[PDB]
Each structure stands twice: as structure tokens, then as C-alpha cells.
Amino acid sequence: DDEEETYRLWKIRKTIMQLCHDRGYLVTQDGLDQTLEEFKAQFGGKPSEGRPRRTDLTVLVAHNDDPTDQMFVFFPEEPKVGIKTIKVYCQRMQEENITRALIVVQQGMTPSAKQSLVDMAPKYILEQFLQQELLINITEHELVPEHVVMTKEEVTELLARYKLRENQLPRIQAGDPVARYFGIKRGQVVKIIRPSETAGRYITYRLVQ
DNA sequence: TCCCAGCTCCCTGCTGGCTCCGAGTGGGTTCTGCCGCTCTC
Incomplete structure (x- = not known):
């Protein structure tokens, strides 16, 4: 109508x-x-x-x-x-x-x-x-946790702290609904903060690649 | 100069093909070609 x-x-x-x-x-x-x-x-x-x-x-x-x-x-x-x-x-x-x-x-x-x-x-x-x-808005769903886009200096500090290469991080596709919502592109790292049953809070980093 | 009809090209949907199917263990059985035809003693 x-x-x-x-x-x-x-x-x-x-x-x-x-x-x-x-x-x-x-x-x-x-x-x-x-x-x-x-x-x-x-x-x-x-x-x-x-x-x-x-x-x-x-x-x-x-x-x-x-x-x-x-x-x-x-x-x-x-x-x-x-x-x-x-x-x-x-x-x-x-x-x-x-x-x-x-x-x-x-x-x-x-x-x-x-x-x-x-x-x-x-x-x-x-x-x-x-x-x-x-x-x-898919970011208001209870299943979807908070996504934070990281800057290049933060990503460099992360990789220096954990002594990691970009390949060893977990991945997220560019066609992901949250990825398209944030307009993220290839090579950037998204930071996921979610509540934890055992530890209370857990932070996960995902590479868009 | 520009409006259509015809050819080109990518996606979608469907059908056929291939691989898989619990871990151990103890007995038993049958089967390991055969007819033949040239060849040798």
C-alpha cells in the first residue's frame, strides 16, 4: 500500500x-x-x-x-x-x-x-x-556483536605485539553483510568485541581478505 | 543524426556423475583355469 x-x-x-x-x-x-x-x-x-x-x-x-x-x-x-x-x-x-x-x-x-x-x-x-x-539494521541483532574498524597504525601495533603475519589472522569476506555495512575493503582489519561465557569479554581480530 | 531488429554474452536452473558409509576379535569353508593341439620320448 x-x-x-x-x-x-x-x-x-x-x-x-x-x-x-x-x-x-x-x-x-x-x-x-x-x-x-x-x-x-x-x-x-x-x-x-x-x-x-x-x-x-x-x-x-x-x-x-x-x-x-x-x-x-x-x-x-x-x-x-x-x-x-x-x-x-x-x-x-x-x-x-x-x-x-x-x-x-x-x-x-x-x-x-x-x-x-x-x-x-x-x-x-x-x-x-x-x-x-x-x-x-543488522548491527542491532543480538547475534551480531560489535565491529570496530581498526586504523593502519593500530594494525601495525597489533602485528608487532603478537608477532603475526597477515595470513595467520582469521578472515572475513568482503561480501559479508557487516563488511558491506561498514564499507570495509580488502586488506583492512576489523576488531570484534563480544561477551564471553567463561571470561566475560573476548576480542577477536579479522582480516578482510 | 538517430531509431530498430538482429547478434553477443553472462547468469540461472537443472541433470548426471562420483565418493562415502564404527572399532576390535575368534572360528569355519572353497579356490587357486581348462580344453586342446601341436610337440616330444
Whole structure:
């Protein structure tokens, strides 16, 4: 229904705000907690043949340390995102001169488009996200523990302390849902803190490789 | 210059093939080619 799809847009915007906050970017508190009525007042009440048309939902955020990181998110119109739409989005990325973006696909993009995302990867970072994936925050589940992204100096200090190579660490795939949530890439180490039945707290390090 | 119809290419779904199947132990049995045809005494 129209009310259901309005709820869907509000919830997915809340998940985008939580993801951008967890990735280290700057979001406002009221942007973090928007109600359904407040979202409807801000963007429109009936999106079908109405005001919120999935184009005005793009978000400008910047990193806390660097105000020129300038990450956007995009909500494509068509359910099947293709090379034409991705080329339009990347050309737009070129004139506003930003490097990183998120694409929130309705159902799925074409294999040629998802390959073009890999081909465009060095200069511009493009990530595919389904609307079904972002309908809930997976980091709030009781099974999922806390994930902390480590800096390069911290990783170097860790490997010097334990006298380890990068191969000897446990691994996590780049296609992992938490890895895609944090936007981690190959070669980085994620730090997992979980409660322990026997010791109380246990810390595990995993290499994204 | 540009709009279609036709060819190209990657993913998805399905079918056929291959490997595996508890640890020890004590007895017993049958079977270890055979018909033949040239060859040798």
C-alpha cells in the first residue's frame, strides 16, 4: 500500500542515517531520529503520483575529520538499474567531484551494471545495496556483536605485539553483510568485541581478505 | 543524426556423475583355469 511504501522509505532512510553515523560521517541527531509523521511532513505523504519521488531523498554527508570527503547516497528510479543509469550517476559524481557513493537498488541491477561498478572502482567507489537489505539494521541483532574498524597504525601495533603475519589472522569476506555495512575493503582489519561465557569479554581480530 | 531488429554474452536452473558409509576379535569353508593341439620320448 502507499502507507506501507512510505513507511518503507522512512525506515530505509533511518537505516542510511545509522550506516552513515557508524561509518564515521557527520549526521545530525534529529536526522538520526525522524518519526513517520515528521518524515511525511518533510518529504510528502503520498509518494505514488506525489511529492517524494525517490529523487529528492539523496543525502549529503561529510566525514568528521575531513569536510571534503563528501559521500552521497542515491535512490534510482527504475527497479532494474543499468549501465545508462549508473553512467548518469557517475557523470554527476564527476561534476560535483566526489569519490564515494551508495546506490539503493529496488530489487536488483543487471550483471553488466554490477561489472561496471567493478570496472569503475579505482577512481570512484560504488556500492550496491538492495532495498530489502536496508529495511533493517543488522548491527542491532543480538547475534551480531560489535565491529570496530581498526586504523593502519593500530594494525601495525597489533602485528608487532603478537608477532603475526597477515595470513595467520582469521578472515572475513568482503561480501559479508557487516563488511558491506561498514564499507570495509580488502586488506583492512576489523576488531570484534563480544561477551564471553567463561571470561566475560573476548576480542577477536579479522582480516578482510 | 538517430531509431530498430538482429547478434553477443553472462547468469540461472537443472541433470548426471562420483565418493562415502564404527572399532576390535575368534572360528569355519572353497579356490587357486581348462580344453586342446601341436610337440616330444
